[PDB]
C-alpha cells in the first residue's frame, strides 16, 4: 500500500551531572532499522534490521556524523529553551523531534512532517503545505522569525520531497521480504466464567503486519464501543503484532455476539462467534 519513514530523536537533560541523553531511531513503516544511542559504548549509528546491513562503510559514517550534529543541535536547544522559559537549572527537560515522509502505492511523494516538542508538548511544527509554521506559543513564535529568516522550511521541503523519498524506495526495493509482506491475523476467541451468571468473551488477534487493524464487537448486528474492553495494539517481539478486544455478557446469550476484524492482509472482512 502506502508506506513511510520516520525518525525519532529524543534528548534528555541531566542537571546534577553529565551531558544529555540522546537517542535516535528510524522506522520504515513499523519495522525499526537504525539506531543511535549516546549512552551506549560504540558511538556509532547501528543497524537494527537485516536488509539495511548491506550498505557500505560510508553510508554508516555519513549517518553517524549527521546524527552527532542533530545531537549537538538538541544539546544547545535544551539550554536555549531554559533561556526562553526562565527555567531553573535543576529540573530535567526533554526535546523530541520527529520527521519523515509518506508515499502512495505509486511510490511518489504524498506528504511530509516535522514536529518539535519540549517537555512533552508541541512547541513548533510545519504545516502540511507550501511551507509555513505553527507555533504553540510566544516562546516558539521566536523560533518562527528565526527559522523564517534562515529559509528553514524550504530546506526541509527539499529533503522531504527529495532524498527522503528517493531513499525510501531504496529500502523497500532492498528489504522486500521483510517490508512488502502483509501477514493476516491469526484470530481465535476465549470464554471465561467470571461471575454467577455474567461471563467474558475475549477475541484475540495474533501475529499480523502491518499494524493497522480494527476489532469491533456487535451485539445482534450493531457497533458496541460501550461495555467492551480494547487493549492498545502491542508488538509481539518477532516483527508482528498482537491485539485483543473482550466483552462482558449475560450467561446463555453468547451466540448473540460477533467479533469483526478489518485488516490489509484480509481480502474480506472477518467475523467470529462463540461456536465451541
Amino acid at each position: 500500500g502506502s508506506h513511510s519513514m520516520r525518525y525519532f530523536f529524543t534528548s534528555v537533560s541531566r542537571p546534577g551531572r553529565g551531558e544529555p541523553r540522546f537517542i535516535a531511531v528510524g522506522y520504515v513503516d513499523d519495522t525499526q532499522f537504525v539506531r543511535f544511542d549516546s549512552d551506549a559504548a560504540s558511538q556509532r549509528m547501528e543497524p537494527r534490521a537485516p536488509w539495511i546491513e548491506q550498505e557500505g562503510p560510508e553510508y554508516w559514517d555519513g549517518e553517524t556524523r549527521k546524527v552527532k550534529a542533530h545531537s549537538q543541535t538538541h544539546r544547545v536547544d535544551l539550554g536555549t529553551l531554559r533561556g526562553y522559559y526562565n527555567q531553573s537549572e535543576a529540573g530535567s527537560h526533554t526535546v523530541q523531534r520527529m520527521y519523515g515522509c509518506d508515499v502512495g502505492s505509486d511510490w511518489r511523494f504524498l506528504r511530509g512532517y516535522h514536529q518539535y516538542a519540549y517537555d512533552g508538548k508541541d512547541y513548533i511544527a510545519l504545516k502540511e503545505d507550501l511551507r509555513s509554521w505553527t507555533a504553540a506559543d510566544m516562546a516558539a513564535q521566536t523560533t518562527k522569525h528565526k527559522w523564517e529568516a534562515a529559509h528553514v522550511a524550504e530546506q526541509l521541503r527539499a529533503y522531504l520531497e527529495g532524498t527522503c523519498v528517493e531513499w525510501l524506495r531504496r529500502y523497500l526495493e532492498n528489504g522486500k521480504e521483510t517490508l512488502q509482506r502483509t501477514d493476516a491475523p491469526k484470530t481465535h476467541m476465549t470464554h471465561h466464567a467470571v461471575s454467577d451468571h455474567e461471563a467474558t468473551l475475549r477475541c484475540w488477534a495474533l501475529s499480523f503486519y502491518p499494524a493497522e487493524i480494527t476489532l469491533t464487537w456487535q451485539r445482534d448486528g450493531e457497533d458496541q464501543t460501550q461495555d467492551t474492553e480494547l487493549v492498545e495494539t502491542r508488538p509481539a517481539g518477532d516483527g508482528t503484532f498482537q491485539k485483543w478486544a473482550a466483552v462482558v455478557v449475560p450467561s446463555g446469550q453468547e451466540q448473540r455476539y460477533t467479533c469483526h476484524v478489518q485488516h490489509e492482509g484480509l481480502p474480506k472482512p472477518l467475523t467470529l462467534r462463540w461456536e465451541p
Binding site: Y7, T73, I124, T143, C164
Partner: peptide
C-alpha cells in the same frame, strides 16, 4: 537517510 539540512537550533 537522515537530513544533513533543516535541523537547526531553536
Amino acid at each position: 537517510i537522515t537530513s544533513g539540512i533543516g535541523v537547526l537550533p531553536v
